Design a protein around this ligand. Structure first.
Ligand SMILES: Nc1ncnc2c1ncn2[C@@H]1O[C@H](COP(=O)(O)OP(=O)(O)O)[C@@H](O)[C@H]1O
Ligand SMILES: Nc1ncnc2c1ncn2[C@@H]1O[C@H](COP(=O)(O)OP(=O)(O)O)[C@@H](O)[C@H]1O
Ligand SMILES: [Mg+2]
Ligand SMILES: [Mg+2]
Lengths: 371, 57, 242, 371
């Protein structure tokens, strides 16, 4: 048989078979319901639109994300998402395919327990395993050491790994992610004259953020340049017309990552959390961590982010160290590639949580050495 | 003009990366001579320390 | 090395009808990696024969085997068999075969192209992990040979494109990965050439008689033993043990 | 055949075939264990890193020395050290090679007996012999009289020998050694604001001690110069940057040898112990012992130690006696050189302890007159 690698992630579910070079199915993790009445008789509209299809009917649905920051908050919606992924996307029966799932660090144990219970009972998967995003991301990068910064749409976390050994006391988590950036972009667009409120327009704002925003190497210099020059202004076409032009707002949204105080968060910027995590670890491995800094996750796809991060860390770090940042082009799908590599390993076949073990030891079996 | 700017970008990147490999070689050789200078400096330093101790004794 | 196999078919009335030929277990490691005291396939040495200058000059082949990387690693030459007349006989046999000389030129030029992939060189980018080429004359001549574009080939080797979900993304490759990819491409193209040649020979040998029950004939390499056994010897020994 | 000269010592194992000019394999005597769990699967980490390898993985290992003060406290670790020395550093099977071992004077008999038993049983060496670390040092100096001061990492001792006749009643042993100096340096470096606690950074502190510490000819004058001026301060580069500057602590660490009271020990200083040993012998050999002082061991490699020791002993000794101190450049490896010289002697071939003899008469052969 063959193993199945699914990544729920946050805001984007991506699944495929193990041993593949890229996930076969990628689609938003959205559940939509109609908010109107419906007058035509005979069409028989379904009561719930799930997955990418909900994007097509975005204008008559109330889109809801089943997960807020890693943690699942609507279990029925998650079951619908998994059913759609297994049946309408991969068209396979999970009754004969072990499942590898990805889960972020420092999360409630009940989350993993319920995930495994649903997988074993509802879908009767023969076996399943749960892994951490950082380890998979490091796997995909062809590295065995270094500190990996995974910043998705739900949560941004830094994990240092040295010679295949983790440093749990140095793992750092920050709830700032892409969703907060989109919300701040909405909040900052209203000062120009454009108001976006409905959940449908959330997607429009997210698309604008993806297509136009970029990270500035210097904030004050760029603001001064934009205050006088108009060469930074770009136009965007809404799905009905009335193009909108944005100037300095394009490089101000991603600055929240380095300046969380914009949105009221007390914590420090990612560039400072990475340095703090590095200094948490032992003194004898700090050079390798400095020289093997790894980036992953969609939120790290902004142009110019790598240079800004390198400059900030070099400013913080001693002048006698070479700071190198690894930013492969495929940051977004690094975690899934790592999961595929992990599932394709031969020695991993004995680490699966078999159905018999779950039945004997109950749902808690997840928290044994089969972490 | 987009194509003209593309040509501008391509030969600009070519020239700057040629300068980049040149400067990489330069910094490597200067770091090597930096190590050598540090070794000779410390060599002279502790040699003089030892001979000064011999002189005082 | 390869496991030649011949199925001799018969008619309904127990009379000879026709023959079929198949090949199996062809080793690709010999193409790139050779032991110190061993040679590569006879094709390359035969091609370097000086009695045909037209092929050498039209392929822009360096007459010195030492310069090339793939062959110089192994033993350069031995007095095994005179390659000149053997190559001439092979060319004559091809000429008296069913297909024309343009195809023979095609195999010769493709073999020459396989020969030049070793001249490729790559240097790690000063400011980036990805490695870009340094020399391109060998790439230019090779791309001219296959009728491809040197820039497109270099971009593909350096930046392979991959399909994820419903969108294409570019992947980053370092020096080791691109070298492995080049070697794999050479081995795969050689294997496909050999398979196509076998299919063409089978088609030419094929006659229009009905194919009833056949008699198989199987020739395989023996349980070779050395004092320096390696992966290829392990595969051969495993096949012999099975 | 050839004989192996293994010098376990403490903190540095050095070994090599007899008759060689210098030892072939030298490496620290530590055993490292991983104190973390490991997240990456398939690497197959070994459960114990032994020898120089542990020095490259200090940041993810806890290091333990199998030898505290000359004696062996963890026999499994010592067996691992011996196996690594025989099978990796030298790559020679001990089945057909006699072995010469060295140990300090005045050690528990159980230590020697168990060492002999392990060597005859586990490794099955054809024969083995045990020597005092002082007599070999005397051999290496091309002398036949005088006193030898062997200040290693674990223990220090003075052994007077006249015309090849040892004087057991005058042998002196003191437990102050390099390890205590390293601990004191760690303790006093706190007053400057640098904290070293982890066993891994004990190696760092040892490196600073080796590179920068030196012995002062006079104590009060150097203290006055350091308090007044700042020409004695020197800067050291840590593995992760943040160069640190040390001043008065530079020469306080090695003074503990002459001032044991710094670390609370009631015993007298090195020079006083040597002087007392000199007079503990007879009166007709005191002049030669004065004129043939020999130093050995790594701890005696401090710059200027010889001059200070000579001055102190001259102050203690009568004026009309010539005092000379022999400090060859190769103090650290003097013991192994002497052992190699001894093993190459033809007359020594009859002093080996044959395996048959041990089997017939039991492990107590070494203590019996067949030394
Ligand atoms: N090119 C881009 N530029 C800026 N942001 C992007 C880009 N591509 C994706 N993103 C952001 O990344 C997020 C997707 O994160 P994702 O990798 O799905 O996290 P997870 O793996 O936790 O699901 C989206 O919300 C989007 O805002
Ligand atoms: N030049 C030096 N300066 C200061 N300390 C030194 C120097 N050389 C060696 N040492 C110390 O000597 C110790 C090694 O002692 P060693 O001779 O190996 O004892 P043993 O023979 O019992 O193993 C080390 O811990 C080191 O700190
Ligand atoms: Mg993710
Ligand atoms: Mg010693």
């Amino acid at each position: 048989t063959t193993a199945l690698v699914c990544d729920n992630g946050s805001g984007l579910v991506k699944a495929g078979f193990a041993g593949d070079d890229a996930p076969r199915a990628v689609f938003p993790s959205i559940v939509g319901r109609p908010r109107h009445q419906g007058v035509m008789v005979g069409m028989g509209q379904k009561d719930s639109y799930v997955g990418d299809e909900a994007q097509s009917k975005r204008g008559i649905l109330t889109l809801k994300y089943p997960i807020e920051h890693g943690i699942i908050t609507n279990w029925d919606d998650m079951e619908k998402i998994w059913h759609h992924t297994f049946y309408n996307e991969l068209r396979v029966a999970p009754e004969e395919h072990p499942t590898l799932l990805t889960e972020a660090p420092l999360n409630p144990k009940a989350n993993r327990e319920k995930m495994t219970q649903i997988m074993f009972e509802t879908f009767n998967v023969p076996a399943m395993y749960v892994a951490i995003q950082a380890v998979l991301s490091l796997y995909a990068s062809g590295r065995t050491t270094g500190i990996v910064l995974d910043s998705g749409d739900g949560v941004t976390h830094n994990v240092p790994i040295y010679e295949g050994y983790a440093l749990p006391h140095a793992i750092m988590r920050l709830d700032l992610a892409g969703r907060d950036l989109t919300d701040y972009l909405m909040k900052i667009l209203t000062e120009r004259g454009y108001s976006f409120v409905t959940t449908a327009e959330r997607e429009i704002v997210r698309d604008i953020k993806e297509k136009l925003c970029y990270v500035a190497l210097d904030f004050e210099n760029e603001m001064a340049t934009a205050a006088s020059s108009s060469s930074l202004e770009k136009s965007y076409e809404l799905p009905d017309g009335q193009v909108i032009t944005i100037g300095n707002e394009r490089f101000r949204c991603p600055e929240t990552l380095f300046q969380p105080s914009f949105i009221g968060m007390e914590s420090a910027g990612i560039h400072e959390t990475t340095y703090n995590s590095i200094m948490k670890c032992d003194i004898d491995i700090r050079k390798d961590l400095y020289a093997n800094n790894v980036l992953s996750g969609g939120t790290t796809m902004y142009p110019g982010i790598a240079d800004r991060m390198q400059k900030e860390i070099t400013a913080l770090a001693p002048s006698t160290m070479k700071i190198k940042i690894i930013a492969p082009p495929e940051r977004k799908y690094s975690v899934w590639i790592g999961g595929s590599i992990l599932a394709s390993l031969s020695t991993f076949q004995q680490m699966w949580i078999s159905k018999q073990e779950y039945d004997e030891a109950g749902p808690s079996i997840v928290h044994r050495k089969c972490f | 003009e987009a194509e003209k700017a593309a040509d501008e970008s391509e030969r600009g990147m070519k020239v700057i990366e040629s300068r980049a490999q040149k400067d990489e070689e330069k910094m490597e050789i200067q770091e090597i001579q930096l190590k050598e200078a540090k070794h000779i400096a410390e060599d002279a330093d502790r040699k003089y320390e030892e001979v000064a101790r011999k002189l005082v004794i | 090395r390869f496991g030649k196999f011949i199925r001799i078919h018969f008619g309904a009335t127990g009379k000879l009808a026709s023959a079929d030929i198949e090949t199996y277990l062809l080793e690709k490691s010999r193409v790139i990696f050779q032991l110190k005291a061993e040679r590569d396939y006879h094709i390359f040495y035969q091609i370097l024969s000086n009695k045909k200058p037209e092929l050498l000059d039209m392929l822009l082949i360096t007459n010195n085997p030492y310069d090339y990387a793939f062959i110089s690693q192994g033993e350069t030459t031995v007095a095994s068999i005179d390659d000149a007349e053997e190559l001439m006989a092979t060319d004559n046999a091809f000429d008296v075969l069913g297909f024309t000389s343009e195809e023979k030129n095609s195999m010769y030029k493709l073999t020459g192209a396989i020969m030049h992939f070793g001249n490729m060189k790559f240097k790690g980018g000063g400011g980036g992990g990805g490695a870009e080429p340094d020399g391109t004359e060998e790439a230019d001549k090779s791309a001219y040979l296959m009728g491809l574009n040197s820039a497109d080939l270099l971009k593909g080797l350096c930046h392979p494109r991959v399909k994820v979900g419903n969108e294409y993304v570019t992947k980053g490759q370092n020096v080791q990965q691109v070298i492995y990819a080049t070697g794999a491409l050479a081995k795969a193209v050689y294997e496909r050439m050999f398979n196509w040649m076998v299919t063409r020979i089978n088609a030419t040998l094929e006659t229009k008689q009905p194919r009833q029950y056949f008699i198989g004939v199987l020739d395989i390499a023996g349980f070779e033993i050395f004092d320096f056994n390696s992966f290829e010897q392990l595969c051969i020994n495993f096949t012999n043990e099975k």
